[PDB]
């Protein structure tokens, strides 16, 4: 376990402390519907999943209006999501991960689910 672990955990901890409005939207609950899958797939799927989100909502006025603070608070969200994507992705080392598109649940929920899992890994490794 290298620094990537810490960077991920750090970003999640930053994402989960600041509740946005774009966080209401949903994504695939790869976690709650967990299978015989291995770690690599998981981080990967998360990367794939997270990609979809900002890949769509980076240009989404619905999340962007209100105040110029929230405008940036959204910028942050997209920024941190992007950073989270690349890390998980590289941590997986897989060319593609076919996401089955099964259940949906809020991104907030998703981020919390993941936050927990990463935390576990960080403490059990050596």
């Amino acid at each position: 376990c290298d620094i990537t672990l810490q960077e991920i955990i750090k970003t999640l901890n930053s994402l989960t402390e600041q509740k946005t409005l774009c966080t209401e939207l949903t994504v695939t609950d790869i976690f709650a519907a967990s299978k015989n899958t291995t770690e690599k797939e998981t981080f990967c799927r998360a990367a794939t999943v997270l990609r979809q989100f900002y890949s769509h909502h980076e240009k989404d006025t619905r999340c962007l209006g209100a105040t110029a603070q929230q405008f940036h608070r959204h910028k942050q969200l997209i920024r941190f999501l992007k950073r989270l994507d690349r890390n998980l992705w590289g941590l997986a080392g897989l060319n593609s991960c076919p996401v089955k598109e099964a259940n949906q649940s809020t991104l907030e929920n998703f981020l919390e689910r993941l936050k927990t899992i990463m935390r576990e890994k960080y403490s059990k490794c050596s």
Binding site: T4, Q6, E7, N87, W89
Partner: protein, 199 residues
């Protein structure tokens, strides 16, 4: 006729500017003769151009502008002259980190026979480095180069407090500091701007 001498080298400040340096065979006008092309080894990411700057009559340097970088990032480097591809390589920032030298080093005189030196962490609180920076203060005497001292700081507060008892009154002292992050196996930063004071 163009030919690179020593293979380009890059360090990252893990914030934005990951500078790169190299030397050609003869004196080149870096700013007009060559171009530096970097790109993120990730899907959907385009290439980037850079106008190199002169670093010694033959030596060139470009500062790779990078919005935000993570541990996983792998970069493509290509050095162009015009249309003749001279050399190309890859570079993973997180691997080779040169922390941004700290600044605003100031000396203070508290009572109780203690000397307080305070500097500021060059990084913002959301930088992946902010929390791993361990500084190394360096206090020395002007005409006594043997009268040098180096104090390690591991705690988060960017402040060291030595005792006056370790300082000769009526004598000039200088202090400079440098930070580094052990978790990233970085190299030392530059020293901070020196400071002078007498007892």
């Amino acid at each position: 006729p163009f030919k690179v001498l020593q293979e380009p080298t890059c360090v990252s400040d893990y914030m934005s500017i990951s500078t790169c340096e190299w030397k050609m065979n003869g004196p080149t006008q870096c700013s007009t003769e060559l171009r530096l092309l970097y790109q993120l080894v990730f899907l959907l990411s385009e290439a980037h151009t850079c106008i190199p700057e002169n670093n010694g009559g033959a030596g060139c340097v470009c500062h790779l502008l990078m919005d935000d970088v993570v541990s996983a990032d792998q970069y493509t480097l290509d050095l162009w002259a015009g249309q003749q591809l001279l050399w190309k390589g890859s570079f993973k920032p997180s691997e080779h980190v040169k922390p941004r030298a700290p600044g605003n080093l100031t000396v203070h005189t508290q009572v109780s026979d203690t000397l307080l030196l305070t500097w500021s962490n060059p990084y913002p609180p959301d930088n992946y480095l902010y929390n791993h920076l361990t500084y190394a203060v360096n206090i020395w005497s002007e005409n006594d180069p043997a009268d040098f001292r180096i104090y390690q700081v591991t705690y988060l507060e960017p402040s060291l407090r030595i005792a006056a008892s370790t300082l000769k009154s009526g004598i000039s002292y200088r202090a400079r500091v440098r930070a580094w992050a052990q978790c990233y196996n970085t190299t030392w930063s530059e020293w901070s701007p020196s400071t002078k004071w007498h007892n």
